[PDB]
């Protein structure tokens with residue numbers, strides 16, 4: 263119920279070095 | 290992982306390492322779907338052709354790791370297995386159809402900035418994301434090339450889902466619905482693929498709807514590591530979603 | 541193998 267939300271990223275509203283690549287692919 | 294790159298600290302708080310007690314060595318990757326349940330590929334625990342049939346009291350689950358060899362003190366957490374569950378219709382005899390399995394820990398693990406569970410898909414999520422072209426992310430502590438050897442820290446690679454037709458024309462093995470392949474075309478330029486040692490690891494996709502991460506596939510099998518024309522086949526988690534639920538409900 | 545030793549308590 264709180265999965266998929268990483269403590270060191272989603273939780274602190276921070277992205278990682280490439281996660282954007284996935285979003286840009288879901289065209 | 291072949292043609293990957295070091296992961297960022299805490300980039301996969303759900304990654305799990307299947308550790309072989311004696312002799313101490315990496316067995317397979319895995320994923321934490323609950324504070325007590327870990328998902329993994331079914332051929333990591335059972336595979337007669339190679340005389341592999343690991344018993345629960347033969348392994349250890351190391352969760353929260355970034356390093357492959359070093360016992361990352363004060364961070365990782367090693368847990369013991371209580372019961373192994375393999376899909377009753379797992380084809381280790383032919384094409385590894387339904388290559389999935391669970392592992393209930395003896396004591397629940399405590400989350401943290403390094404240990405956090407991943408979300409399992411629903412019919413809707415799976416529907417809109419599992420599409421050829423849509424990239425996913427694979428990570429593991431496996432070989433760096435088909436034949437350096439192992440990596441120092443967890444490897445990662447974003448790969449694009451490939452079309453059913455293409456997958457089937459890339460092999461001689463019977464490709465079922467319980468699986469899908471992912472990878473870059475020879476022309477596309479980019480490479481990357483899982484490899485021996487990466488089995489069991491999680492193939493995830495971050496949902497653009499609620500920004501939560503989801504495990505769509507489980508690293509299953511392949512023919513060579515990162516060969517052009519060759520792709521990687523991952524267990525289609527959602528299609529096996531019912532068996533998973535049943536195994537956790539009953540237990 | 542080349543793996544660091546894991547504390548006994550877990551074995």
Ligand SMILES: CC1NC(N)CCC1CNCCN1C(Cl)=CN=C(NCC(F)(F)c2ccccn2)C1O
Pocket residue numbers: 332336383384385462482483484485486487488508509510511512513514515520521522
């Ligand atoms: C080499 C790998 N490459 C990848 N892209 C992803 C994972 C890889 C790890 N291999 C471990 C799992 N595997 C096992 Cl037990 C047996 N035969 C494998 N490959 C050979 C094969 F012809 F494709 C195959 C597929 C299905 C059943 C038997 N043999 C295999 O793959």
